[PDB]
Design goal:
heterodimer; A: little secondary structure; B: 9 helices; binds the ligand CN1C(=O)/C(=C/c2ccc(C(=O)O)cc2)c2ccc(N)cc21; transferase; serine kinase
Chain lengths: ~10, ~270
């Protein structure tokens, strides 16, 4: 499963 | 002078539209992080004691600076024509919690309990100082791999803590509460508790539970990893759809899942060395 950062 | 009091090194971080350099302070070889912020790119502005108009981030960092190491310490700042420069005290060796969870997968509950407990104390510290962080997430948390101490960083989306309603938000959407998604308003403490619920699921399941607005407002939490009943209950409590149903910081730390936390050094010895 694709784990990703999330910008503000 | 500025480029004369700090030895300046390479860029820090994962790679985004932000500019934070590793540095060393010539005065005493103190590791520093040197953060640059473009004036044209600043959301909220504040006034310092001298009436000097500064980015809100500077105001908030001053209010939380202290001998309590749960929060990044601002040591100095400089104004420049088109930008501000923030000198932050840089721990080392460190890894941020996002990369840590990616490399290690879902954390043992003992480790997640130590980490979550330290975040709770750091956020309590912010609130006692009048500061709302508004971007609690694994990306904004550094682990001191040697001392086992966690550090809340990047106050660039924060605000002064207040008891009335907030109608603006510049944090991370997948960590924001359903009252923000549905109605574009929230209160600060209960929105923080929601993000702490997202954070704790992140720690024990290896990733955040929700990616889409519909999931955030849906009120359902599926557990993708083996997680204890106690921890599931705390997580679901923090992620109650109704803000007034969420726990206070006191209730979180009195939760049975939170008892018998390890100390930082124990945490480093058992889980980080
Ligand atoms: C190795 N390393 C550091 O020393 C960091 C210092 C850092 C401190 C504060 C802010 C802030 O904005 O307050 C930003 C950055 C840092 C940050 C992210 C990642 N992944 C690695 C890091």
């Amino acid at each position: 499963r694709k784990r990703r950062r999330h910008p503000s | 002078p500025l480029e004369s009091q700090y030895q300046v090194g390479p860029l820090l971080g994962s790679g985004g539209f932000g500019s934070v350099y590793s540095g060393i302070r010539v005065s005493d070889n103190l590791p520093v992080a040197i953060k640059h912020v473009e004036k044209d790119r600043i959301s909220d502005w504040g006034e310092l004691p001298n009436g000097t108009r500064v980015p809100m981030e500077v105001v908030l960092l001053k209010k939380v600076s202290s001998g309590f190491s749960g929060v990044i310490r601002l040591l100095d700042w400089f104004e420049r024509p088109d930008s501000f420069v923030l000198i932050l005290e840089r721990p080392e060796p460190v890894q941020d919690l996002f990369d840590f969870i990616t490399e290690r997968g879902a954390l043992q509950e003992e480790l997640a309990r130590s980490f979550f407990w330290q975040v709770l104390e750091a956020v309590r510290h912010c609130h006692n100082c009048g500061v709302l962080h508004r971007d609690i997430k694994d990306e904004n948390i550094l682990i001191d791999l040697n001392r086992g101490e966690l550090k809340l960083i990047d106050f660039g989306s924060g605000a002064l803590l207040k008891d009335t309603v907030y109608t603006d938000f510049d944090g991370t959407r997948v960590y924001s509460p359903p009252e923000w998604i549905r109605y574009h308003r929230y209160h600060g403490r209960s929105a923080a508790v929601w993000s702490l619920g997202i954070l704790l699921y992140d720690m024990v399941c290896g990733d955040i539970p929700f990616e889409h607005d519909e999931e955030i407002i849906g009120g359902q939490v599926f557990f993708r990893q083996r997680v204890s009943s106690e921890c599931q209950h705390l997580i679901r409590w923090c992620l109650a759809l109704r803000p007034s149903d969420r726990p206070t910081f006191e209730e979180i730390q009195n939760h049975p899942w939170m008892q018998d936390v390890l100390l930082p050094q124990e945490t480093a010895e058992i889980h980080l060395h």
